[PDB]
Amino acid sequence: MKLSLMVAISKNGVIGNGPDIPWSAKGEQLLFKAITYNQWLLVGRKTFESMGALPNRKYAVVTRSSFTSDNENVLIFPSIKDALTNLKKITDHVIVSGGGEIYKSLIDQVDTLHISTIDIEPEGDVYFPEIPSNFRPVFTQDFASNINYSYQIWQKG
Amino acid sequence: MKLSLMVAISKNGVIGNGPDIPWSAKGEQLLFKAITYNQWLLVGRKTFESMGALPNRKYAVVTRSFTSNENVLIFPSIKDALTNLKKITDHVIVSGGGEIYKSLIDQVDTLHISTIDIEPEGDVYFPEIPSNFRPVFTQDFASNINYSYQIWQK
Ligand SMILES: NC(=O)c1ccc[n+]([C@@H]2O[C@H](COP(=O)([O-])OP(=O)(O)OC[C@H]3O[C@@H](n4cnc5c(N)ncnc54)[C@H](OP(=O)(O)O)[C@@H]3O)[C@@H](O)[C@H]2O)c1
Ligand SMILES: NC(=O)c1ccc[n+]([C@@H]2O[C@H](COP(=O)([O-])OP(=O)(O)OC[C@H]3O[C@@H](n4cnc5c(N)ncnc54)[C@H](OP(=O)(O)O)[C@@H]3O)[C@@H](O)[C@H]2O)c1
Ligand SMILES: CCc1nc(N)nc(N)c1C#C[C@@H](C)c1cc2c(c(-c3ccc(CN)cc3)c1)OCO2
Ligand SMILES: CCc1nc(N)nc(N)c1C#C[C@@H](C)c1cc2c(c(-c3ccc(CN)cc3)c1)OCO2
Ligand SMILES: CCc1nc(N)nc(N)c1C#C[C@H](C)c1cc2c(c(-c3ccc(CN)cc3)c1)OCO2
Ligand SMILES: [Ca+2]
Ligand SMILES: [Ca+2]
């Protein structure tokens, strides 16, 4: 199983402010929609409560509580380890989709990074790990919008 | 000016049947929408006429004969289109169709190729890919028709 990771990071390193992403960069969400279409997303419970079960995605949610969901495209796991060993039974690719705790726990295990750098300096309290030294950028594209953003794909080597 | 190219190619090489893309692979259009957002697209007249003008894109259209929208620039040759585009942008995405892909494949820097798991009828093919391109990223998608997205770099 291959692991990807997808995140939008602001210019000062903030990715979240409580339960919210503290910007709206028109167009950037299209990258997320395209890369996650019909994919398995591994998400922390807090991010799942904020985003909800959006259509055409499948979710592996990790929680240490009795948090549940009755949605047929959402699976609840008591640990990241159980999520990953179970996902390997069904799929060859999982996309780590946040939030801060899940990115920190999985960055050293992922194979491909999708990073959108957002030209804003917002307030917040959720951050992103340093990119491990064995990653190299392989594709980059800039976008002008209401808030500019740049998309970069990194591969582990 | 960097030139990218984006195309969806079926498994027998067909990209078009007359004016149509001869399949519907749900989800694949999201890749095209995401990569082209607020970008300059270089398109042949047949593709532009067949597709129209998506919102939030800018179009450089080549024709030998056609008029148009303040987001659409029309040029009488590919040479003229590229010379003028270099004045106003640092990046253009070649977005079809077959004639334009065959004219520009040797000049582009980055390929976005979605391989569509279908063998449709059709009469428009993609050109041979120069040997100096290598894939740098791949992701597979299961859908009503499966597809695989690859990015190649020169
Ligand atoms: N691209 C972006 O900018 C982006 C993308 C996604 C999210 N975010 C932001 O990230 C923020 C949320 O991040 P966050 O760090 O507070 O929370 P989070 O990572 O979304 O979820 C944390 C919760 O996941 C569970 N958990 C974590 N590690 C676990 C483990 N090893 N085993 C089992 N369960 C585990 C726990 O749930 P329980 O408390 O239920 O036990 C934990 O409280 C939001 O602001 C959100 O908008 C930003
Ligand atoms: N699968 C995909 O990803 C994808 C993406 C785009 C399009 N397509 C397909 O591709 C097909 C259309 O391709 P096509 O090859 O028939 O047409 P095309 O490349 O879209 O446009 C051809 C027309 O562009 C003008 N033109 C071409 N070269 C020129 C030059 N050097 N200078 C000035 N004008 C020039 C001419 O317009 P005038 O005739 O007006 O002189 C030509 O008739 C459709 O089937 C369409 O569905 C597929
Ligand atoms: C066909 C798959 C699949 N594909 C798609 N598109 N949507 C789905 N909803 C499922 C599914 C599913 C369920 C049956 C499922 C499948 C699994 C599971 C688990 C699981 C195992 C242990 C715990 C511990 N609480 C929780 C859930 C559950 O572990 C690997 O496979
Ligand atoms: C396939 C997308 C697509 N994927 C990739 N990787 N590269 C691309 N260069 C295109 C494209 C395109 C243009 C021509 C375009 C623009 C459009 C389109 C459609 C369209 C697509 C599928 C059907 C189904 N028969 C009908 C139309 C196509 O609908 C309005 O605007
Ligand atoms: C796009 C940002 C984005 N960009 C990139 N590069 N990587 C990412 N990982 C995300 C993200 C995110 C999280 C999971 C998130 C958190 C949310 C969300 C939504 C949301 C997304 C799309 C739609 C479309 N209707 C609606 C909601 C998404 O809704 C409020 O909490
Ligand atoms: Ca764990
Ligand atoms: Ca020519």
Please enumerate in sequence order all residues whose Cβ is within 8 A of that of A114, keeping only pairs 6 or more positions apart, or say none.
Answer: A4, A5, A6, A7, A31, A35, A151, A152, A153
Nearest chain A alpha carbon to B37:
A27
Disruptive mutation site among B137, B152, B154 for chain A (greatest number of A CBs within 10 Å): B137
Total domains, chain B: 1
Q: How many CB atoms lie within 10 A of CB A62?
A: 23
**Cα(B154)–Cα(B147) distance, integer angstroms:** 23
How far is Cα B70 from Cα B86, in angstroms, rounded to an integer?
A: 18
By CB atoms closer than 10 A (0-12, 13-18, 19+), residue A156 is middle
Expressed in angstroms, the distance from the first to the final Cα of chain A is 17
Q: What is the dihedral of CA A84, A88, A93, A99, to 10 degrees?
A: -10
The dihedral over CA atoms of A63, A113, B135, B37, expressed in degrees to the nearest 10, equals 100
Method of determination is: X-ray
CA distance A36 to A84: 17
CA distance B130 to B101: 12
User: B50 in helix, strand or coil?
Assistant: helix
In three-state form (DSSP H/G/I as H, E/B as E, the rest C), the secondary structure along chain A is: CEEEEEEEEECCCCCEECCECCCCCCCHHHHHHHHHCCCEEEEEHHHHHHHCCCCCCEEEEECCCCCCCCCCCEEEECCHHHHHHHHCCCCCEEEECCCHHHHHHHHHHCCEEEEEEECCCCCCCECCCCCCCCEEEEEEEEECCCCCEEEEEEEEC
In this complex, is the C-beta atom of B38 within 8 Å of any C-beta atom belonging to chain A?
yes
Closest CA to A122 of A23, A20, A19, A8: A23
Q: Are the Cβ atoms of B151 and A139 closer than 8 angstroms? A: yes
Token match 């791949």: residue? B138
Which residues make Cβ contacts (< 8 Å) with residue B28, sequence separation at least 6? B8, B114, B116, B141, B143, B147, B149
Print the domain residue range for A13: 1-157
Q: B11: which DSSP letter?
A: T
Give every CB contact of residue A120 below 8 A, 6+ residues apart in sequence. Answer: A10, A11, A22, A23, A25, A147
A·B CB contacts under 8 A: 58
Pick from B26, B38, B90, B147 the residue to mutate for testing the A interface (most A CBs within 10 Å): B38
State the resolution, in angstroms: 1.4
* B24-37 residues labelled b (16+ CB within 10 A) or e (exposed): ebebbebbbbbbbb
Q: Name the residue among A97, A35, A90 with its Cα closest to residue A61.
A: A97
With CB atoms and an 8 Å threshold, state whether B38 touches A143.
yes
Angular region, A32: left φ>0, alpha ψ -120 to 50, beta rest: alpha
Rounded to the nearest angstrom, the minimum Cα separation between B147 and chain A is 11
